[PDB]
PDB file of C-alpha atoms and ligand atoms in Angstrom:
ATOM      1  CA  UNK A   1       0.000   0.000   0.000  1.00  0.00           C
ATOM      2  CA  UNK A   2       2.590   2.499  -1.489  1.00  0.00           C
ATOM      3  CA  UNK A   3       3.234   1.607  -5.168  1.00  0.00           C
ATOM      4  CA  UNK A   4       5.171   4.269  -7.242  1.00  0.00           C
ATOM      5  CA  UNK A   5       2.798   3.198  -9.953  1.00  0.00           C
ATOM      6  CA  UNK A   6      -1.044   3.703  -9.790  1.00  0.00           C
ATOM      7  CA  UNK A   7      -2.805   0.372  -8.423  1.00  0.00           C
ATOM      8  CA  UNK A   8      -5.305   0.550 -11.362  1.00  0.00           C
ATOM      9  CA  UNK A   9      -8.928   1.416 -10.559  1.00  0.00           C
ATOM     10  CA  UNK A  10     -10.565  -2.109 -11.794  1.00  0.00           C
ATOM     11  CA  UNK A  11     -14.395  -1.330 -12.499  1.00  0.00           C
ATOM     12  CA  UNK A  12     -15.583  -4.329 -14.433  1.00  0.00           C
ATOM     13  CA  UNK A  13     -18.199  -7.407 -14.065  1.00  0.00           C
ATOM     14  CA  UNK A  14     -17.799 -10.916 -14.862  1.00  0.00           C
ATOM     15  CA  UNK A  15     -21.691 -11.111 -16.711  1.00  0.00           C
ATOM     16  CA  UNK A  16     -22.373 -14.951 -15.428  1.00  0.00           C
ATOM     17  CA  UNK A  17     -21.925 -14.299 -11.367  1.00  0.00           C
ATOM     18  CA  UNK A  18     -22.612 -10.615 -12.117  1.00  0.00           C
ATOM     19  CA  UNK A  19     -23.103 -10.026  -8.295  1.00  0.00           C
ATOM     20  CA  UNK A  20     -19.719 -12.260  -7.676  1.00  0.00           C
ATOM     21  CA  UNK A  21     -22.460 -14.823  -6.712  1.00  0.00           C
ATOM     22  CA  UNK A  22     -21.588 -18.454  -7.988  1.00  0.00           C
ATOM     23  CA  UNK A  23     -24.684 -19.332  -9.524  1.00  0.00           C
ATOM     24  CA  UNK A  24     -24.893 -23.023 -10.291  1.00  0.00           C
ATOM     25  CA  UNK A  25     -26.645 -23.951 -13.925  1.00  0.00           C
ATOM     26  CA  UNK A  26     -29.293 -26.347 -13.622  1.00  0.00           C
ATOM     27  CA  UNK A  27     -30.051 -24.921 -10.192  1.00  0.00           C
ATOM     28  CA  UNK A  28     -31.603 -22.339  -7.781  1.00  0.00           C
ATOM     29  CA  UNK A  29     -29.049 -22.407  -5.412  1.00  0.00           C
ATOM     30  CA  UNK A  30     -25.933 -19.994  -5.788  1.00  0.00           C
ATOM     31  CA  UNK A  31     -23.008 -19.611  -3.386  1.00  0.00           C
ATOM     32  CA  UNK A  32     -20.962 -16.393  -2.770  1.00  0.00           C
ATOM     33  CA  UNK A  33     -18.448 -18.538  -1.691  1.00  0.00           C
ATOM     34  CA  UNK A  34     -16.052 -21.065  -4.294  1.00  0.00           C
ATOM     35  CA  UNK A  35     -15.230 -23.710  -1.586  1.00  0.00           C
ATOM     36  CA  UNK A  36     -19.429 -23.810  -0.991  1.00  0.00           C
ATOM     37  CA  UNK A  37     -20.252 -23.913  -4.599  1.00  0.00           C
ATOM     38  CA  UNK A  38     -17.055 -26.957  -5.448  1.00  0.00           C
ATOM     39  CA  UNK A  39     -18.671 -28.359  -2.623  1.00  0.00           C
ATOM     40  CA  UNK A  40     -21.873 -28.645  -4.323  1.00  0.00           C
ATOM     41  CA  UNK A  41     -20.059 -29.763  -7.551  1.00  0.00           C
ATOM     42  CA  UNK A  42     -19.084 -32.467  -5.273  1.00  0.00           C
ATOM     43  CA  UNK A  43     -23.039 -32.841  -4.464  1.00  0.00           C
ATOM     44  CA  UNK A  44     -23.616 -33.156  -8.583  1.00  0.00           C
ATOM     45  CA  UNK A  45     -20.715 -36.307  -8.043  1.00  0.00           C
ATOM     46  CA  UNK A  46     -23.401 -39.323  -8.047  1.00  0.00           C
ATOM     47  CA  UNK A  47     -20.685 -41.780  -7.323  1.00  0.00           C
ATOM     48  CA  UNK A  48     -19.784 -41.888  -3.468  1.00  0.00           C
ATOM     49  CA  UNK A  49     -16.050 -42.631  -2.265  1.00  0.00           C
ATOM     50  CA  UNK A  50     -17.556 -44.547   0.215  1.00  0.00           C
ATOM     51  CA  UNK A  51     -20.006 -46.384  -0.893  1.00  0.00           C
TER      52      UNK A  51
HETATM   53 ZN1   ZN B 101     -25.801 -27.502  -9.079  1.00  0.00          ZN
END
């Protein structure tokens, strides 16, 4: 927090999580959180480890 060059003002959006939301396809439920949404990319993994 002292950089001899400017930081850069970065003003965009990604369009698909607009918000920064992680909003799922093929579902309602959206997590503002990565490790929460991978974890329900886990829950669309049918196959169990232990099974
Ligand atoms: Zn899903």
């Amino acid at each position: 927090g002292s950089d001899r060059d400017t930081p850069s003002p970065g003003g965009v959006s990604e369009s698909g999580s607009e918000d920064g939301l992680y909003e799922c396809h093929h579902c309602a439920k959206k997590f503002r959180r990565q490790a929460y949404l991978r974890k329900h990319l886990l829950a669309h993994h049918q196959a169990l480890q232990a099974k």
